């Protein structure tokens, strides 16, 4: 049992809610919140910009140290950093960015990172400003993630379309 509330069950292990991931995280304080990261951990926009702002830029400061020590992530890759005031941990996952010409086939590899965590609060990878089709991202999520994933979709119109088109 966990405290996630108001989710619709899509499959045994995938749940979805029309919610602001920042507010979900602040309320639930999950063990893991997923960030829609880029390889440089530059949290400027989309989900990353929102999560970082909610940490008053502490996520960015921590990320800058991570990059100085380790260098960039790979597309499809991830790292675990602090969740600050949002969660115990933040799993920074890099989905392909179609607006950078990156190969959407790497989306499955990106979602595989979720399987290293028994429970996650997450956005749909490669959606929003990353340019991929969110319906396809949800399909890959369902077909890749085996651990328990609670998806937060802020945009109500998109949420409704994701539910109504789910196979």
Curated annotation (Swiss-Prot):
Catalytic activity line of the entry: Thiol-dependent hydrolysis of ester, thioester, amide, peptide and isopeptide bonds formed by the C-terminal Gly of ubiquitin (a 76-residue protein attached to proteins as an intracellular targeting signal)
Membrane topology term: Multi-pass membrane protein
Domain annotation Macro: ranges: 1-167
UniProt note on regulation of activity: Inhibited in vitro by GRL-0617.
Signal sequence interval, chain numbering: none
Subcellular location(s) per record: Host endoplasmic reticulum membrane
Coiled-coil parts of chain: none
Protein task: Responsible for the cleavages located at the N-terminus of the replicase polyprotein. Participates together with nsp4 in the assembly of virally-induced cytoplasmic double-membrane vesicles necessary for viral replication. Antagonizes innate immune induction of type I interferon by blocking the phosphorylation, dimerization and subsequent nuclear translocation of host IRF3. Also prevents host NF-kappa-B signaling. In addition, PL-PRO possesses a deubiquitinating/deISGylating activity and processes both 'Lys-48'- and 'Lys-63'-linked polyubiquitin chains from cellular substrates.
Subunit record text: May form homohexamers. Interacts with N protein.
Protein's UniProt name: Papain-like protease nsp3
Lineage of the organism: Viruses, Riboviria, Orthornavirae, Pisuviricota, Pisoniviricetes
Parent-protein residues present: 1025 to 1191 of 7096
């Amino acid at each position: 049992v966990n405290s996630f509330s108001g989710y619709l069950k899509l499959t045994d292990n995938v749940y979805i809610k029309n919610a602001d991931i920042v507010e979900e995280a602040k309320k639930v304080k999950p063990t893991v919140v997923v960030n829609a990261a880029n390889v440089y951990l530059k949290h400027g926009g989309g989900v990353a910009g929102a999560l970082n702002k909610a940490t008053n830029n502490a996520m960015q400061v921590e990320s800058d140290d991570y990059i100085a020590t380790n260098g960039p992530l790979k597309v499809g890759g991830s790292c675990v950093l602090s969740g600050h005031n949002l969660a115990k941990h933040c799993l920074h996952v890099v989905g392909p960015n179609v607006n950078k010409g990156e190969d959407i086939q790497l989306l499955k590899s990106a979602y595989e990172n979720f399987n290293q965590h028994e429970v996650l609060l997450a956005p749909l990878l490669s959606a929003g400003i990353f340019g991929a089709d969110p319906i396809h991202s949800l399909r890959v999520c369902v077909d890749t993630v085996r651990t328990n994933v609670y998806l937060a979709v802020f945009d109500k119109n998109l949420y409704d379309k994701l539910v109504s088109s789910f196979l």
